Amino acid sequence: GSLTEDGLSYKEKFVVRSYEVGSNKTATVETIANLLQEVGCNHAQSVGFSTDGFATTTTMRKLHLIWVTARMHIEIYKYPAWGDVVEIETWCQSEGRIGTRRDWILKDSVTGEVTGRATSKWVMMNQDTRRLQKVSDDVRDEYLVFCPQEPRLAFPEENNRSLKKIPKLEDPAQYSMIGLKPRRADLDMNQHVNNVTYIGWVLESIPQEIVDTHELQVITLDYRRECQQDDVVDSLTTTTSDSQFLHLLRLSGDGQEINRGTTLWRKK
Amino acid sequence: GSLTEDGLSYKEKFVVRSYEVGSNKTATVETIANLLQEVGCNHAQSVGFSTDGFATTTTMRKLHLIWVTARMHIEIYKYPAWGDVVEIETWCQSEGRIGTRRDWILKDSVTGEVTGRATSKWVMMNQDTRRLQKVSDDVRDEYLVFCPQEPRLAFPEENNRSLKKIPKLEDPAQYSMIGLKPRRADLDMNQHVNNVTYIGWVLESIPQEIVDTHELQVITLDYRRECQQDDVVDSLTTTTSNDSQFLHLLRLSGDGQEINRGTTLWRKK
């Protein structure tokens, strides 16, 4: 992969692997989400962020502050098949003092056609207290030089699917998958549950019949609280409708919300 | 990746990804095991095996026969770090009428030094009845042209760990992790549990303190029965032993039916 000519975005090509595909012989949405993190990580490294994995500025490390995902929104028009080459372009932009947004564009490297797009909201949090903080002047100055100054959006539409407020699923749920626990493979280099594991957990309560006759087109997921490697999660789903579903992940015991989301599926 | 000059082995390079590494900032043994399947799959495709994923000959498809793993043996000297390039070479050889063996050699693409090696035993099974069988003459003729004829072993040693018989763990186990279930990400393109998920399940009952102070050096795993996507597994571990050795057992949560048995050897960090 490499930074573009202006040094304000990063592109990388990936050949889809045999173990990265599902029943349709195309990449799962979890494989796509993993590739989005990989190209984001590779972009931060290319623009000077140290080999520790955190895209944190010098002042952020002094204050023990890290970036955390608040929301992920993915829309796939075509999933790449095993052996196909997908090209992904990523970039970041400041959203005032609220935080930052990382966007992605997926293309079929053979035709150049846009096959998907994704957007994410990131907030500054103290890594020890877990307290959310607004973005200070000094910190924004350190990362503005890595962002395009004119707006560049993967989802330009005024008040579109990526910015739609998500309601809380009311009991009883139509479908559920209980007792979901992460294993060591679900953790990252810092022993925290990988963000992509939560997408997998959300999708677990989708009936197999919907999976067998539909393809996932859109997924929006809000991140409320982390699952610790010793926690247990319940995944709840209710059809709201193409088929649309409302989702909720909560702790198995006390019912504490960890994520909420929505998915849109198209008939095969 | 590409076949070597003689067309009897296949090499492929991989750049280790950020999400493929563990706490030490090196590739997990599950990432390595996934790369071993990928290079094996790419080798079968390169030598003519159809895009359906099964390295099955024309006569095997007519008889509804597939290859299934009986045993996996992996030994890692050094795990590659995030951003490092690992080169993996793979090949297959017939083991008479018993079945086939696929071997792998892992190298640091920068120094060329051998950083790991792996071997696996494969048996022929009817896809529908699940009945195992010896390899017929006609089937062996179809795949011999893809194998080196002179023996080529990743584990040449006289008393190597890849061929050592594994005992059954006796209750009570010293350690355990119960209620392990696969999710859709654990399945393959045919809706079957990926072989690498079982390695993950075996390793779940290793205490976190061993993980935090040791590195996995060797793992041998026997595959007895398949876990269905609706099954639930218990992972059992008992220390058998500078180095730490463990005996492992995966069994169904309810009836206690054996899924896998194995052994791991760990060395102090």
Ligand SMILES: Oc1ccc2[nH]ccc2c1
């Ligand atoms: O989704 C991700 C995950 C990790 C990252 N590091 C830097 C950007 C980025 C994006």
Ligand SMILES: Oc1ccc2[nH]ccc2c1
């Ligand atoms: O912390 C940041 C913010 C904006 C960025 N653009 C590119 C990398 C990056 C890291």
Ligand SMILES: Oc1ccc2[nH]ccc2c1
């Ligand atoms: O909750 C929000 C809303 C907008 C945002 N922009 C960037 C981060 C963020 C978080």
Ligand SMILES: Oc1ccc2[nH]ccc2c1
């Ligand atoms: O380990 C593996 C898995 C799948 C495969 N297909 C062909 C060879 C091979 C090896």
Ligand SMILES: Oc1ccc2[nH]ccc2c1
């Ligand atoms: O079925 C087989 C046996 C040996 C092989 N060598 C390479 C691919 C392959 C497939």
Ligand SMILES: Oc1ccc2[nH]ccc2c1
């Ligand atoms: O149990 C065994 C023993 C030797 C073998 N060689 C190939 C498959 C196989 C299985």
